[PDB]
């Protein structure tokens, strides 16, 4: 599912257990993502879902929920 794929992307990049990858979890504050991690997460979401996340939209991707909601509507 879309959610499962999003979890694997995040788990692979941040090394966090999927059980902690919840909708309200902030990549930085809750999942420990640093600046490079965030850039790589965006790059991965684009590659895996075949879409583009313009800089503007990328800035709004702060939680797991943002990515899921964004992708569900866009793809
Ligand atoms: Na993986
Ligand atoms: Zn891989
Ligand atoms: Zn697990
Ligand atoms: Zn923040
Ligand atoms: Zn928090
Ligand atoms: Zn891009
Ligand atoms: Zn947009
Ligand atoms: Zn948000």
Swiss-Prot record:
Q: Give the principal location in a single coarse category.
A: cytoplasm
What does the record give as its pathway? Lipid metabolism; fatty acid biosynthesis
InterPro entries per the record?
ACP, ACP-like_sf, PKS_PP-bd, PP-bd_ACP, Ppantetheine_attach_site
The record's HAMAP family line, in alphabetical order, gives:
Acyl_carrier
Q: Where in the cell is it found?
A: Cytoplasm
Per its UniProt record, what Pfam families does this chain match? PP-binding (PF00550)
Task: Write out the GO biological process terms.
Answer: lipid A biosynthetic process
Please give the superkingdom of this protein's source. Answer: Bacteria
Q: What is this protein called?
A: Acyl carrier protein
Give the keywords, sorted. Answer: Cytoplasm, Fatty acid biosynthesis, Fatty acid metabolism, Lipid biosynthesis, Lipid metabolism, Phosphopantetheine, Phosphoprotein
- Tell me which residues make up the Carrier domain: 1-75
Primary role: Carrier of the growing fatty acid chain in fatty acid biosynthesis.
PTM entry text: 4'-phosphopantetheine is transferred from CoA to a specific serine of apo-ACP by AcpS. This modification is essential for activity because fatty acids are bound in thioester linkage to the sulfhydryl of the prosthetic group.
Q: Which residues carry this modification: O-(pantetheine 4'-phosphoryl)serine?
A: 35
Any one of the GO CC terms: membrane
Q: Which PANTHER family match?
A: ACYL CARRIER PROTEIN, CARRIER DOMAIN-CONTAINING PROTEIN
Tell me what gene encodes this.
acpP
């Amino acid at each position: 599912s879309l959610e499962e794929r999003v979890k694997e992307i995040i788990a692979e990049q941040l090394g966090v257990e999927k059980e902690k990858i919840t909708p309200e979890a902030k990549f930085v504050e809750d999942l420990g993502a640093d600046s490079l991690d965030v850039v790589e997460l965006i790059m991965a979401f684009e590659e895996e879902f075949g879409i583009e996340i313009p800089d503007e939209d990328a800035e709004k991707i702060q939680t797991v929920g943002d990515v899921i909601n964004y992708l569900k509507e866009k793809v």
